[PDB]
Every structure is written in structure tokens, then in C-alpha cells.
């Protein structure tokens, strides 16, 4: 029916492999599996994809994270809920992490401000939960731990590349990273 | 005597705060503290600084990391040596990490290839040490562990920004980060 979402999918990958500037809109629809010039109806032109792609997913992850917090019985499980929830994003949507890391600056200034706002709030969602579990942590302490863990979790692009993606490797990748992050937050709490 | 290094120093800060593209060579020497056109003798023009800056430091960190391996009494101590050696770079040379994050693409093809070559080998130095400490782990495990740890350590620029640099905060950053990375690497050895 609607060839739009099929086209976004193609953009995500092509922006992930070769750079945003490297990728030309012409071969987005070609590699996508879509018609000729009917593409130039909803995604003229290139920058328009990047914005929906980044701004969209970023707004979700903030909502999705703030949901985990609301739905959690207590704080202990809220932290686990986040760890898992981010791990899902981290291992599943490994393309968007690379796009975050490179092509965030080739986003229109209005949308860039917007995406950064969401990231900041998403870190603050963690900080909130991380800091209420251990009130002896300062703001900057929670932040440090929060970015630390994300740094660790979002390091997957340097390991979970296209020539890989085997589900046996993914679940083992998940198993470890989880184990790493939980033990990293615990070491932090004890240190301070 | 020779105001080249003073010019290098200026560059690092200016490339870190404002983007590479945004930085004009004119105001590198201005904010640096140097003469007018005598600058245009050893660093014409802009791109030249970025290459010496990145290629120099990258090639050093490889050497420095490979030194830690050699001189260390045993393997367990070689890991602590590396963790501490990277912490030195991660927290101290915070500017470069932000430049490695963004403006690696605006390096000439020959230099970019060389900078990535060093990063790759620097990871392999860890891999080598991390894999001999636990031969139960396969290659792809020790890679994921290495990149995991670097993601955690190189998350500093999201906290230790220019509006700060109070040494009390850095020793705390160093203490937490080390504690987190050491606890994380063991969790990895256990889980798998």
C-alpha cells in the first residue's frame, strides 16, 4: 500500500553504511525497491529522511524510557527495565546509533536542537532512577554513570557489523553487555 | 622560541569547541597568541593541523599501550596498566576524543587510513592482553569486551566540559570510571 516506510528503512541502512553526504537520494529508492519519480512525492530530498528518522526514533526512546519508569513496581526493576530497553535499542537498532555518532550535524538546526533535547531528557530519565536508588550520588555522579553505561552499550557498532548479525552472536552480545553494565553501575555505587 | 606547538595547542581547543568546518585558520593564530602571517609558514592551511594532531597522538597511544604490555610484570598488571593509560588519555586529552568523534572524516584519505589503522591496532593490544588473561573467551568476545570498555571510558566529553576543569571532579571521575571498567571486565569473564 504505502511505499513510504519501506523507503525510510532503505535510508537508515544506506546512511549507516556510507555517510549521509556519500548517499545520493537517487540510489535510496533504487536499493529500496520502489518506483522511479513517485519517490520525489514524500521525501524530497534526502535531508527530509534523516530528520524523520532521527527526530522520530529519539522522541520514541524518550517516551519508551519514561514508560519503563512509570510502569515499574519499584526502582530496582525500573533500572533493569531501562538496561533491557536500551539494550534492545542498542543491539536491535545499531544503525541509528552510528547515524547519531556521525550525521547528527547534517540535520537541520531546528531538528538538531530537537534531537539533542530528547537525548538530554532520556539521560535525565536514567539519572532520576539511578539517583533515587542511591541518594548518596550527586547529579554529576548519576550523569557520569549514565553516560558511562550508554557509552558501553552503544559501542556495539564496532562489533555488531553487517557481516555478522547472527542471532546466536546477538544474544551472547546481549548477555555480556547486560552483565557488564549491571556490574559497572554496582562498582560505581560502592566507589562513592 | 618556536611557536608551532603553541599553534597546535590552540587548534585542539578550537577544533573541540567549534566544529572543524566552523573554525577558520585566521582565528586559530589569533586566539592562540602568535604573530600575523608568520603562521602561514608551517601550518597552511587548517587541514594540516588536524592531520599532525590526530596522526601524532594516535600513533603515540598505540606505542604507549604496546609499551605497557611489554614493561608490565605480568598480564594481570598489564591490564591495569592499560586501563590507567587509557584513563590518562580519556580524561586528560578530552578534546582529542571529541575531535576523533566528529572530524575524522575531514582528514585527508591517506591520513584517515593511517589514523584508523592505529585505532585498530590499539584495540588489538587490549584484545591480545584481554584474551591471554582468559583463554576461555574467543576473539569476538575479547573484541566486544575491549570496545565495551572504550565506550565506557571515552564517554567523558559528555560530562567533563570546558565549563569546569576543577581537579577534584576529575579524580572522582577517574576513580568511578576505573572502578566501573574493572568491575565490568570481570563481569564479562564471569558471564561467558
From TrEMBL, chains A, B:
Residues 1-61 form the HTH tetR-type domain. This is Probable transcriptional regulatory protein (Probably TetR-family). PANTHER family: HTH-TYPE TRANSCRIPTIONAL REGULATOR RUTR, TRANSCRIPTIONAL REPRESSOR MCE3R. One of its GO terms (molecular function) is DNA-binding transcription factor activity. Residues 24-43 bind DNA. Homodimer. The lineage of its organism: Bacteria, Bacillati, Actinomycetota, Actinomycetes, Mycobacteriales. It holds the Pfam family TetR_N. One of its GO terms (biological process) is negative regulation of DNA-templated transcription. PROSITE patterns: HTH_TETR_2. Keywords: DNA-binding, Transcription, Transcription regulation.
Amino acid at each position: 500500500s504505502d511505499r513510504r516506510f519501506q523507503l525510510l528503512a532503505a535510508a537508515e541502512r544506506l546512511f549507516a553504511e556510507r555517510g549521509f553526504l556519500a548517499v545520493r537520494l537517487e540510489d535510496i529508492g533504487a536499493a529500496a525497491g520502489v518506483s522511479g519519480p513517485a519517490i520525489y512525492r514524500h521525501f524530497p530530498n534526502k535531508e527530509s529522511l534523516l530528520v524523520e528518522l532521527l527526530v522520530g526514533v529519539s522522541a520514541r526512546l524518550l517516551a519508551g524510557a519514561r514508560d519503563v519508569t512509570t510502569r515499574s513496581a519499584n526502582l530496582a526493576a525500573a533500572l533493569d527495565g531501562l538496561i533491557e530497553f536500551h539494550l534492545d535499542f542498542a543491539l536491535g537498532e545499531a544503525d541509528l546509533i552510528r547515524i547519531q555518532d556521525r550525521d547528527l550535524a547534517h540535520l537541520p538546526a531546528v531538528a538538531e536542537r530537537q534531537v539533542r533535547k530528547a537525548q538530554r531528557q532520556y539521560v535525565e530519565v536514567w539519572v532520576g532512577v539511578l539517583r533515587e536508588l542511591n541518594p548518596g550520588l550527586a547529579e554529576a555522579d548519576a550523569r557520569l554513570m549514565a553516560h558511562a553505561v550508554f557509552g558501553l552499550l552503544n559501542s556495539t557498532p564496532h562489533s555488531m557489523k553487517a557481516a555478522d548479525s547472527k542471532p546466536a552472536r546477538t544474544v551472547r552480545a546481549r548477555a555480556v553487555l547486560r552483565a557488564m553494565t549491571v556490574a559497572a553501575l554496582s562498582a560505581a555505587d560502592r566507589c562513592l
